């Protein structure tokens, strides 16, 4: 997993139907780091340090194995920084 | 944005889950929460049409199995001017 | 073997419903009823 | 060890009733699922007073015949509903057919 | 008066009939009419014990066939002094 | 006595009968009546723990017969400060 | 903390049992009691996530066999700045 | 305390057994022993409601087969204030 | 000398006979004789549990066939302090 | 408070749960936890007879599903002054 | 007196009930409580022979169905002077 | 050798004690609500 | 932190595994280890409520199949002040 | 696998239920390196050089094939540095 | 080294066989023998991980068919600084 | 409440 802070929300209307009705959140390892996007399986407000799982596990993390995303927020860190 | 998403629930706990999930899913503004009566509670958001579509779909999934459940999730991309009279502008 | 008070008692003659003027002539009266 | 003894020498499984198999009249601290032994505020059928007919018979009452439908979100949970909206839309739209019923203007699956 | 009479009904139209039948029947005062919720309306009358007895019997007989009907008809000949705080004094 | 006893009834007539019975039967003060809606009416009594227990039991017995009846009977001997704020400690 | 515990119940007796349990079982603050209608009562608490998880668990178990029971018990770790405005700041 | 427990018996020997069992079981107070005539002897105890329930239960069991026996074991958690003028304050 | 022996009889003759037998048979002091009404008389002794268990056996033997008979033969091995107010003092 | 309430558990985790549940349910004092041996631990509380009844009931419910479980739940509403020697004054 | 009475129980709750039932029952002094290991607890009393016979029977009946119950209730009217060393003098 | 073979009061003899029905969780939301692991319990025997 | 986690085991090897796993899972302080008797050993940690919840869940999984097994894993987020008297402050 | 030192513990109360009751440890390739989080399948004390595995493997390593995890400590290095 | 080997056994004969085997089979230090109760005896050794693995394996095999046998055999590669304080530093 | 009533008193799914 990686510790990434939520920066904002992302919205793709043309997203594949396999993504389902699942929120997507822009994330980064620090402010200024490359911005990734993760399926929000938990409900995370912007500015929240979060746990993000990577390959394969993420698909099960939100939705089934079929569900696509290779990044998913599996939790919010009780306290970081 | 002037599009209206709205999610109705059989109670307030599913409604708060919907509001939170909608507000967290996309850049939409929680403009109102209503106690319709009979335990129907409606949460209403206003935002850009794509943002509201993203919000309402995520809200409905969040509250479907929460509490007594979901009743409706509706998106209205262009709302008529006459219907904007019966829509709240800020929550209470 | 001696077994009981051998003194006959008026009170103990029975066991060691509401009677009132309300009871009188109930059937005859025609009027407002209460229950 | 009594004189007689020497001369002669010559239940529930659980203290608390099953949670499923009982419902308590008064919940909370009034619960009577657990068996407290000792001097405990409980009262035999021998003892009369306070509750029972001594609280139940003081005031006259008539229970009328009006049990009527509940109009509520919970009573409407199994209302008959019209056929579910479907989508024949094509192209990349996030057209998920498996989630909760989102709807657009006119009852169009969204 | 000291005695309390009460007629609960499913709907206002049955209750107004009970209030009228009760107040016409004996010397009782309509001290309150309360919308409990869920379509239950209670009509409350305070008079002497004899009048409240006769009144509440009149109300129950009148409203039973009116509308949805009667839920309850109760007489409390002297409420505790504590129950007075939760009893209306004048209808609103 | 900080013990709290609440009886939930369907209807105000049942709730009033319950209150009367509890107060008469045991040493309790009638702290409040809240109309829950859906027609649930809750009568709350605060008293010594044992007293509250007896009162609630008596009320339950009495209330069930009248009206729709008992929905619930509960006794909370020690109420957390936070809860005190929600229950109507003020008698009204 | 900014976590939310909500316990919807059918009636206010289960809600007051749910709120006592939550408040005694963890360092959470009862922020509100809502009557939603149809006899749904939501008791909402606010505190750090672990406290809210312990509290919601205790409350759900407590209010389950009290009266008409539990409709929902839900934890929201972090609550959106927009959902804050539909949430009672202090109990009433 | 204000709860009253009363164990009537047929003779003073079943009432001294009942009074001993009552006073030892819980923190009650013999407020009077009465000779009613006919052989009836009443043992009246006044303590808290929890104590009086425990005491009368112990007293009724103790004197059931002692002498001519138990007539009545009866608890009143709170008597009316007018029923307290026909109650003994101290044993004679 | 803390135990109590108690013989209730139907008349004063059986009681005086029991008192004599009890006081002669063991180390017990006769503390009082009570007329209970209805023809019951009670002879109370106070001594040690063995002195008393021996006196009350001897006493019941004496007065069983004397007059109308014995009603009760009871021993209380330790008497609660409260029950001593309802007990005759030894000058009786 | 002079009533004793003792819960016995198999193990310490159920006993600490009982202590907590009893101390939070009623105004009782945890007076001691005793390791009886054979994995029996007794928690003893002391308060008024109603507080002790509530506390023991709370403790029993709470500890019935924590660990090996509840062996006993008992009340002594009045305790002899002799037993105060074998009872622990303060938890240590 | 020098008679020994000895109730043994599985656990301490049954033993405190036995001790209290033995001390209230007769003129006996609780001379000790022993944790023997394996769950066993032995309450020992000392007093005259009849005092002890009436206490050890009151104790056994009281604790018979409390906790895991009674193992042994035994009276020794005089103990050898060598058995006094393995007997506690005062409770700890 | 006397006739006294008696029950063992021990952690191992209590291994198969009768136990009350297992706590369950109807809690919703992200709580780490695992229903498959060892029985963790919260205040009041509430599955944790 | 003032929350109390505690894990009981049928022996010390499962207990050490639990203590190690709990201390390693989250920032909690191993405050005590107890030999309850009968082979029950309890490990107790004190930390922040989230940390203790994380610790106890990990400890229980670690020791479930180790040795003779786990008995209890309990978390208490708010511990009463009275129960803090029977809780160790530093291990021995 | 990667050789990463444990820095501390991590606690997400809002973690997904699929993570089970499994410890999580902040890790790094050196002090000052980006901080990752790994499911502690072994018991590792802070300051322990450890062996952390890749994502699919991680799930099986962490105890279930479907377990959500892309990093797991499969051992502690008998001696490092 | 800072690894721990623990071999719990039923009795001390299997534990002494377990500890001889462990100490002869690898360079590990016997740090403690604990009597836990219920006839559980834990022999704990400390050394580098490989030595502890060899030792625990030898010990388990050795103590398995000796007496009542092995309850547990467990290796902890690195032991938390907090678990250190519940661990015997030197054997006794 | 019709004088007589008192005198005597003496669909589609969607």
Numbering used by the authors:
A (entry chain PF), N (entry chain PO): 1 to 81
B (entry chain CL), E (entry chain IF), F (entry chain GF), G (entry chain HF), H (entry chain KF), I (entry chain NF), ...: 6 to 97
C (entry chain XF): 685 to 700, 712 to 730
D (entry chain YO): 726 to 735, 770 to 869
L (entry chain YN): 822 to 869
P (entry chain YF): 726 to 735, 770 to 773
Q: What is the paper's account of this structure, in its own sentences?
A:
These organelles encapsulate 2 cargo enzymes: Ribulose-1,5-bisphosphate carboxylase/oxygenase (Rubisco) and carbonic anhydrase, using a polyhedral proteinaceous shell. Self-assembly of the α-carboxysome is mediated by the intrinsically disordered protein CsoS2. CsoS2 functions as a linker protein, connecting cargo enzymes like Rubisco with the shell proteins.
To address this issue, we reanalyzed our recently reported cryo-EM density maps without applying any symmetry (C1 symmetry). Fortunately, we were still able to obtain maps for the T = 9 and T = 16 α-carboxysome shells at resolutions of 2.77 Å and 3.71 Å, respectively. The construction of structures using C1 symmetry maps yielded T = 9 shells with a diameter of 36.9 nm and T = 16 shells with a diameter of 49.2 nm, which are virtually identical to the structures obtained under I symmetry. Intriguingly, we observed a complete and continuous density at the centroid of the inner surface along the 3-fold axis within the T = 16 shell C1 symmetry map, whereas the corresponding position in the I symmetry map showed only limited weaker, fragmented densities. Specifically, this relative position coincides with the junction of 3 copies and the 3-fold axis under I symmetry, suggesting that the density discrepancies at the same position in maps of different symmetries are due to symmetrical treatment. High-symmetry processing involves a high degree of data averaging, which can lead to the fragmentation or even the absence of complete density. Based on the relative position and conformation of this density on the inner surface of the α-carboxysome shell, we have reason to identify it as the density of CsoS2. Although we were only able to partially build the structure of CsoS2 from Ser710 to Thr721 owing to distortions in the density caused by superposition and averaging of the particles during cryo-EM data processing, this result is a meaningful complement to unveiling the distribution of CsoS2 on the inner surface of the α-carboxysome shell. The results of this study indicate that there are also potential CsoS2-binding sites at the threefold axis of the facet of larger shells (with a diameter >44.5 nm), thereby augmenting the theoretical number of CsoS2 molecules within a single shell. Furthermore, the comparison of maps under C1 and I symmetry reveals additional CsoS2-binding sites on the inner surface of the α-carboxysome shell.
